Ligand binder design. Structure first.
Ligand SMILES: CCN(CCn1cccn1)C(=O)Cc1ccc(Oc2ccc(C#N)c(C)c2)cc1
Length: 187
C-alpha cells in the first residue's frame, strides 16, 4: 500500500546525520504558501508523529532573486529568536499576497511589526549563530541536491512525492501526506 515511487522516492546516496524530518520551503513558493495557510501540512504531520520526534524546516536561496538570500538569513534569525510562528504568515503574505516585501528593509519591518525589537533583529542578523544557521540550511539543500520546493525528507533517505498522492481533495491529500511521513519515520 506504501510502495516506493508512489508516495515517496528514495535517495541514491543518503545523507548521514540528517534530521529525522526536514522541510524545505521558500516564501516565494506558491505551493509552500498553501502548505502553510490552507493545508497546514507541518502541524498535521507533527500530529501523526511519535511525540518524541523533532521536525526541522529550512528556507532556500534559489527562488526570488537576491531576496531569496535575504529571506534565508531572515529565517535564520527567526529560528535563532524562536519567532517562526510570529513571522511566517506576514512574510508569506508580504511576499506573495501584497508583494510589499521587496528589500531587506521590508523583511525587517515585518519582524518589527511582529514584536521583535529593531536592534535585536539587527544584532541577530549579524550574529555568528545566524551565520552558522545560514550555512546549515545551504548545506542541507546541497546534501540532497535540492532542485525545488516544497520538499520533505525523512532520515535523509526518503523524499515525499505529493504528486503521486491524491490531490483532488485538500483534506484527503493532507491525511495521505501526514500518514506517509509517519510510515517513513517508522522505517
Ligand atoms: C517540487 C515541485 N513543485 C514546484 C513546481 N510545481 C510543480 C507543480 C506546480 N508547481 C511543487 O509544487 C510540488 C507539488 C506539491 C504539492 C502538490 O499537490 C497539491 C498542492 C496544493 C494543494 C492544495 N490546496 C493540493 C490539494 C495538492 C503538487 C505538486
Amino acid at each position: 500500500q506504501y510502495e516506493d515511487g508512489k508516495q515517496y522516492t528514495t535517495l541514491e546516496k543518503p545523507v548521514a546525520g540528517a534530521p529525522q524530518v526536514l522541510e524545505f520551503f521558500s516564501f516565494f513558493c506558491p505551493h509552500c504558501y498553501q502548505f502553510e495557510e490552507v493545508l497546514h501540512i507541518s502541524d498535521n504531520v507533527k500530529k501523526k508523529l511519535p511525540e518524541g520526534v523533532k521536525m526541522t524546516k529550512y528556507h532556500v536561496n534559489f527562488m526570488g532573486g537576491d531576496l531569496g538570500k535575504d529571506l534565508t538569513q531572515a529565517w535564520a534569525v527567526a529560528m535563532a529568536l524562536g519567532v517562526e510562528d510570529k513571522v511566517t504568515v506576514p512574510l508569506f503574505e508580504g511576499v506573495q499576497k501584497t508583494q510589499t516585501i521587496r528589500s531587506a528593509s521590508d523583511i525587517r519591518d515585518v519582524f518589527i511589526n511582529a514584536g521583535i525589537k529593531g536592534e535585536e533583529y539587527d544584532a541577530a542578523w549579524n550574529s555568528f549563530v545566524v551565520k552558522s544557521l545560514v550555512a546549515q540550511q545551504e548545506k542541507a539543500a546541497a546534501d540532497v541536491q535540492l532542485r525545488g520546493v516544497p520538499a520533505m525528507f525523512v532520515n535523509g533517505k526518503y523524499q515525499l512525492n505529493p504528486q503521486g498522492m491524491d490531490t483532488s481533495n485538500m483534506d484527503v491529500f493532507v491525511q495521505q501526506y501526514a500518514d506517509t511521513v509517519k510510515y517513513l519515520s517508522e522505517k
